[PDB]
Amino acid sequence: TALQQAFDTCQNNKAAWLQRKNELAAAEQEYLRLLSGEGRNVSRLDELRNIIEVRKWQVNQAAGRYIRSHEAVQHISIRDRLNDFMQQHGTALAAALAPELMGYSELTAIARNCAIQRATDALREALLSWLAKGEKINYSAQDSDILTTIGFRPDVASVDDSREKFTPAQNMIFSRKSAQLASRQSV
Amino acid sequence: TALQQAFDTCQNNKAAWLQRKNELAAAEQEYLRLLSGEGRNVSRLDELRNIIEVRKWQVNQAAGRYIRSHEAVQHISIRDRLNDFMQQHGTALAAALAPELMGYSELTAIARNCAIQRATDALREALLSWLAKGEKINYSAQDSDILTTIGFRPDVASVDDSREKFTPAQNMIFSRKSAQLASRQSV
């Protein structure tokens, strides 16, 4: 059920990110409408600037969380598909890559990890040969639906909103401002 | 036919290493027998010591060449078995690994490498799992006899005799010594 929980967590993260962008855009458009108005309302303009910038920070945080969740679910799907395919064809890969992986026993696990490296370079060569052959690759039909829903990569809007970085001090003052925003809107 | 060529190269290299080591053993035995005798043979002792040194250098070079040939033939066997198994199960590999390798041909070199590293380390955890549960490993059916002949690892007499790390100047002066010794034994 790990795949299902990863998938629906990614789904609700996507929904939350869309909602964050929705009221960010709404706040921006009504703020520029207020700017176009004849009313001075200097305090109104300042606190709208505060609202829109904290909403931008919240949108960035939501986009980062969604990107992390998408990466996590993609990694989990890769792990499960590689694992059950590996169980399906363990003997084939074993026979193919044995001359360095034979006789694992224990060997202090220090000669064996460098042997694993000396086998994974060969696996990298295998993938290079496959990819130079250049056939068409499709998703695994066992769990292709969830991967198609989440897509190959996060949307361009997410990465565009996650370009800039924030210092820890900025992060915690932003969290405090978000908490005060929630407190004031609750009342 | 490259695998057979590598196998016969390894065979003749190890035969040359064996003949070098037995010649060195005979030379050292003759030197110690002469030393045990009462004959002065000061110049004879010096030239026998020179023969011992050049035979030791030749044994080291032969052991290094045999180790290199064994590594080369093992790598060739890895490549051949890998190619056969991968032509067998390319579709299965693609289905298992797809969620992280789509559209590589249009990706730039940076994206190329970043995708290759993720493929390699995903295969890394896959191999760690296989090696963790760890069943009994055997040779590939097609090339079992060659692996039996060459062995999983080179003999300890090869590895312990290649730990001198002679400098290049030592290498070429010893080559000159071997050349002049061959010239004078021919006469």
Residue numbers in the entry:
A (entry chain h), B (entry chain g): 4 to 190
What's the publication's text?
Phage satellite P4 polarity suppression protein, Psu, a building block of the viral capsid, inhibits hexameric transcription termination factor, ρ, by presently unknown mechanisms. The ρ hexamer adopts an NTPase-inactive, washer-like, open-ring conformation until NTPs (preferentially ATP) are engaged and RNA is bound at the SBS, leading to ring closure and RNA entrapment inside the ring. Our cryogenic electron microscopy structures of ρ-Psu complexes show that Psu dimers clamp two inactive, open ρ rings and promote their expansion to higher-oligomeric states. ATPase, nucleotide binding and nucleic acid binding studies revealed that Psu hinders ρ ring closure and traps nucleotides in their binding pockets on ρ.
Irrespective of the bound nucleotide, all assemblies contain two open ρ rings, denominated ρ(A) and ρ(B), that are laterally bridged by multiple Psu dimers, with the ρ CTDs facing inwards and the ρ NTDs facing outwards. In complex II, two hexameric ρ rings are bridged by five Psu dimers that connect ρ(A) subunit 6 with ρ(B) subunit 2, ρ(A) subunit 5 with ρ(B) subunit 3, etc. Complex IIexpanded is a complex II constellation, in which both ρ rings are augmented to the octamer level by incorporation of two additional peripheral ρ subunits, providing binding sites for two additional Psu dimers. We further refined complex II (ATP; global resolution 3.8 Å), complex IIexpanded (ATP; global resolution 3.6 Å), complex III (ATPγS; global resolution 3.65 Å), and complex IIIexpanded (ATPγS; global resolution 4.25 Å). The incorporation of additional ρ subunits supported by additional, bridging Psu dimers in complexes IIexpanded and IIIexpanded is facilitated by a further increase in the inter-subunit and ρ1-ρ6 rise values (10.5/11.1 Å and 52.4/55.5 Å, respectively); thus, the helical pitch in complexes IIexpanded and IIIexpanded is large enough to allow expansion by additional ρ protomers, as they can stack on preceding subunits in the stretched ρ rings. The most peripheral ρ subunits of the ρ(A)/ρ(B) rings in complexes IIexpanded and IIIexpanded are not stabilized by contacts to a Psu dimer, as no appropriately-spaced, unoccupied ρ subunit remains in the opposite ρ ring. While clearly defined in low-pass-filtered maps (6 Å resolution), density for these peripheral subunits is weak and fragmented in the cryoEM reconstructions refined to full resolution, suggesting that they are more flexibly connected or bound sub-stoichiometrically. We nevertheless retained these peripheral subunits in the final models. Irrespectively, a long natural rut site RNA would have to access the SBS via the lateral opening in the ρ rings. This lateral opening is physically obstructed in some of the observed ρ-Psu complexes (ρ-ATP/ATPγS-Psu complexes IIexpanded and IIIexpanded). ATP or ATPγS are bound similarly between all neighboring ρ CTDs in the ρ-ATP/ATPγS-Psu or ρP167L-ATPγS-Psu assemblies.
